[model samples]
Target: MKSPIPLRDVPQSNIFRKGDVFVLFGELFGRGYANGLINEARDAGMTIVGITVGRRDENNALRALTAEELATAEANLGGRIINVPLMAGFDLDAPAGEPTPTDLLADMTLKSWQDDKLDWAHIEKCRAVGVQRFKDGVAKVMAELDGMIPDGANAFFAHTMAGGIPKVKVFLAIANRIYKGRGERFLSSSALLNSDLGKLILMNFDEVTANTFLHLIEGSAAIRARLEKSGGQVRYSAYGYHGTEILIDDKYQWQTYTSYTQGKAKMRLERIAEDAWKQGIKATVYNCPEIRTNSSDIFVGVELSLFPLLKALKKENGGAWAEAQWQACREVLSEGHTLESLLQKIDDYNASDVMKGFRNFEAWPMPNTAELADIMIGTSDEITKMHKSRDALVTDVLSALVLEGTGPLMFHESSNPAGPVLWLSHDVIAKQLNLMHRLE
Candidate 1:
C-alpha cells in the first residue's frame, strides 16, 4: 500500500539499467537541474533524446530550429532532438490576425498598469491557441519518440520546463520595481496581484509551469502503455520549489523565499504528479532548494539561505575537508572578514523578529510584508558589498557549488523517489555535497 504521508526522503532504485532510454521532455537551457539527470543517464549508458522549444523569427513567428541551430543543440544535449517549436506562452500569439497579448499589454505603462483594462475573454482565447499549439508539437515529438524506444526498454522522461514571463517591455520596468527596487522605488507586490496584468501573468504561469506536464502525460499515453505492456517501465520527474528545510538555530527547519509568485502554479505541478501516481504512474516532483541561476537571480534575497549550508556541513560531519571549504570561502572576502563573520551576519538576519514571524509552515508562500522586504533587499545588498569581486566570489564559486550539490540530490532522489512530492532540504543537500566531494 502507498504511504499516507505526503513527503519523504528518496529511496533506492533498481529500475534503470544499460540500454534504457532517457528523454528530456523540454528544451535544454543553461546550467540547471536537468544536467544532473543527463549526466547520470550518460554514466548508466542510457540513450539520450531531447526536444527544442523552437526560436522565433524576426517577424515574431515560431519556427523549428535551423540546420545550424539543430547541430549545436544536439551537440550540447549529447543526444538527438526533435526539431519542433514548443514554446509555451501566448504573449506573442493571437487568433488569426487579431492583436496578440503582447500587443494588448503594449499600451500598459507604469502609471496605467494597475487600472488599465485587459480583455480577459480575448486573452483566454489566445491562451487556448497557444496551448493547442504546444500539444500539437508534443504529439508530433511523441510519435517520433515512440519509434526510437525498442520493446522491453525502460524509459525516463524528465520535464524541466517552467517560467512564463510575458514579453511586454513595461513588465521589465515593473519587475525591477517589484523585485529589485528599494526606498521610494519599492513597489507593493499586492498592487501587482490586484491588477489584471498580474492575473494574466498567473494564468500564463499555470499554462507554462503546470499545465504542460499534463499535456506531456496525455499526449504520450499510448507510448507509455506500449512500454509497460512490453515488460518495460516508465518514470517521470519534474522540478518544483515550495520551501526548504535549512539549518536554523542548530536544527534543520522549513523556510521559504517569500512572495513566491509562482507558488500556486508549483502546487498545481505537485497535484498533477499526485494524480498521475494514483493511476499507477511512477511520477515525482522534487522541490529543490534555492540557488543562483540565470532566471532566479532576480530574486534578490535567495542567496541568504545558501550561507546556512556551511553550518549544515559542520553539523553533519566536521573535519579537515569541511574546514578547508570554510577557509576557501573566507579567502574571497575582504581583509579581516572571515567565513564565521559572514555566517554571523546571515544568522542575525535570519534570527530577526520579522524573519522569525515568517516561518509559519501553514502560512507558507506568505504575503509579503514591508518589513520583510526591507530586510531581505537590504541584507542582500550588504552581502553583495562585502565580496572582494562580483564574478568570482559568492556568485561564482560558492553559488556554483550549491548548484552542483543539487544534481546528486535530485538525481539520486528521482532514481527511486519516495513520494510524488519530495523536498530536497538542506540536510539532504549537505549530505550529498559532502559525499560527492569526498568531504566525509
Candidate 2:
C-alpha cells in the first residue's frame, strides 16, 4: 500500500514556550538549520541542552569534553552539554589494537581503489563496535537529561547528526576527482559507488544519518514514557534531504541534486519516522530544500535551486523586499551587472536541457554523468564570477536566510507535522521568509 506523505505549510503559532526543554541531540556547528531553531527556542524561553559528537585525541581515541572544551562548546550552543562522545561513524574505529577502517583505506590508490577488495567481516565488526559506542553514549546522555527535566514539561529532541565521510586522505583525493574534478581530471562517480569502499561508506551513512534516529528513540524510551505519563509531550525532529520542490515554470515542482549518494540513507530516515509515528510517537522528518553550506559545497550544482528563492519572494508579496534584496545584492557585484541580468542567466541555465534532465523525481540522485558535471561546474563558475567577493554576495546572504528559515519552518510544522515526512519546499520557504523578514 502506498502511504500518502503530504507537504505541510508552516503553522502560524509557535510550538515552543517558556519552561519547555529543547534538547539539541547534536553539537552546534557553523551556520546551519540548527542555529535558527536555537534562536526560536531562546525566544520562546525554553531551556536548551546540547550534546557533542565528541572529538578524537591525537591517538584517535574518543573522549568526553574537558572542562575547557565543555566551556567552549557550551558557549557555541548557548546551552549546557552532556559531554558524552556520541560520534556516529566507524571509519576511524576498530577492535582493540586492530587496524582501523582508515588504516585499511589508506593503502588504496586511485588506480587500485575501485578494484581493491576490503575485509567485509572486519568492517562489519568495526561497524558493530561503533554502534554500541554511540548507543551507550546516547543512553548516558538521556539518563542525565531525564533527571534534568522537571515533571510534566514539554520536550523537543532535535536530531542534527549527519555525514560519515572517512578521514582518510586517499578518499579526500578521490572525492575531489569525483565531485570537483572535470575534463582530464574527471572521474566517474559510478566507479566509486560500485566499489567496496563506497558500499561501506553507504552503510556508514545509514548508521550515522538514519539509524542514529532509531537509536535516539529506543535509547530515550524510559524518559519519553515518563514525560508523557506526567502529562508532558515529547517530540522528535530529524533533518532530511530528499529533493526539494522549487519554482519551475512558475510552479513549485520537485527537483533534486544529482549524484546524491546519501539518498538511500535519507529514505531510511523517513521510514524510521514513519515507523515511530505508527507507534504513536510524534516524530517528523523534514525534507529541506537545497542550500550551499560548509559541508555541501562539494556538490557542484546545488546552488541552482537556490535561485528560485528570488522568484518565490516576489510570489509571496515580497516584491519590494525582493527588489531591495536585489539592489543590495547588486552593490556587491562588479559595476555593469544587475541582479535582473544575473537571475536571467540562472533562469537560462535552469531551463537548459542539462538542468531539465535533473528534474525527474523518480530518477532522482541521478548518476554524475560527464554531461551533468560539465553543466554544474560551468554554472557554478559563471555565478561566482558575478560576485565582487565570494565571501559576501546575494547568493551567500540568501542561502544563509533559506537555511535560517527552515528552523522556524520545521519547528512550526513539527508541532503537528502533516505526515511522517514533510517537504519544506519553495512555498513554505517563501511563507517563512515573508514572516521572518516581515515582507508580508
Candidate 3:
C-alpha cells in the first residue's frame, strides 16, 4: 500500500519536497527518460514539481509551446501548468523569430509556477516536452560537465545522481578543487555574458551557435537549485524594494542589469584566467577586453565561456579542495540549501537586510549599492589588492555574481574558509557591482 501521504506537504528537508522545483533547459532525453524521472520521483513519494522544456528547430532557432500545448498542459496538471513562453528573451533555436526551449522552460518552471503547487496532470504532459529536450540537452549538459571538470572530480555528480545532494554547493566544491587559490569560484550563466570573448562571438550570430549552449544554461540551473536548497531566494527578475515587499518595476532593465552583474562578476574570472595562463611556465595573458557593453548580452556570453572552463578545471584537478569546491557549487545549484540562519553563520550574509525588514539577510543574498561599497572598501580590500590583476578580477567578480551567495535567506557555515570567506570581502563585492554598472 502507499505510505498514506505522510503529510499534507513534503517537509523542506525532504530531497524531493512537494514544492521543490527543478529547471531543465534543453531536452536531455526522449519522452522515455522524462517519464522515468517523473515516475521515479513519484515512486519515491515526491512530486516532480515542474520542468522547463525547450527545443531547437532544424534551423537552430528555438520553438516554444503554443497556447494549445499550454492549455493541454494545464488540463493535464490540473491547472498547475505554467506555460513559460520564453526566458531571457533569447531563443537558442531560432534566435530571431522563434522561441527557444530554454525560454519556454523558464517560462513554465520559473515564471509560470512562481508561487503555485505542482499540477500532476499538467506536469505529466510537460514531461513529454521535457523528454524531447532532454534527449539533446542532457547530453550537452553532461558533455560540458565532462569537459569542465576532471574525470575523478565529477564523483560529485555521480554520487549526487545516486541520491546525494545534487545541489550547487557540489559545483562550487568542484570548482574550488580545480581553481585552488585564496579566491572563491562564483557561479554564473553564459560565460560570454560575463566575459568579452563570449560577447564578441555572439554579437554576429543570430542563434545559438552550438550544442554547448545547453551546458551553460544547465550549469546555471544547477547553481540556482543549490542556492534555493540553501534557503536562498532566486529572483528571476530585478525588483525595487517597496516597503516589505519587492515590486517588479522593469523587465528590459532587469535583463540589462543581469548582464551587468556578469561584467561585475569578473573578479573571480580574472583570477581563474590568470591561474590557467600560469600553468605553462612562461605565462601569457589570455586577454579579451570589452570596448562596448551589453549588460544582458554579457551575462549570456559569460555563461557560455564558463561551461567548458568549469569541466576543464574539474578535469585538471582531481578530488582535491578545488574539485570539492566545484562539486559543492554544482550540488548547491542542483539541490539548494536548507539552513536559513544568517547570524547563525557569517559566510552566508549578503548585507542588504540592514535597511530592509527582511530576516536573516545573509544566505549569500546580493549586496546593495551602498552595502556592496562597504564590502569592497571595508572587508574585501585586502584580497582585491593581493590579486594585482584588477581588470581580470572585475571580470571574475561578474562571473561569480551569477551564482554568488546572494539569496533571500541564508544558511550559514563556511564551505571553503580560505576561498568562500576570503572571497566575500567588501572589495570583491564592490568589484561585482562596478562591472554590473558598466554593463548597465
What is the TM-score of each predicted model, taking all chains together? Answer: 0.94, 0.95, 0.21
Model 3 per-residue lDDT tens digits across residues 16-51: 333333222222222211232333334434322222
Off by over 4 Å in 3: 1-14, 24-30, 45-63, 74-82, 85-440
Clashes of each: 0, 0, 155
RMSD of each: 2.5, 2.0, 22.8
Candidate 1 lDDT, tens digit per residue, 318-395? Answer: 666667778778878887667777788888987999998877766656777778779998988787778787664654
lDDT of 2 by residue, 184-220 (tens): 8888878888998888888889999999999999998
Worst 10 residues of 3 by lDDT: 154-163
Candidate 1 runs further than 4 Å off: 1-14, 293-296
| TM-score for predicted model 1 compared with the true structure | 0.94
For candidate 2, the 10 contiguous residues with the lowest summed lDDT are: 1-10
> What does candidate 2 score in Cα RMSD to the true structure?
2.0
lDDT of each: 0.80, 0.82, 0.27
Residue 89 shift from truth in candidate 1, angstroms:
2.2
> What lDDT score goes with residue 435 in model 1?
65
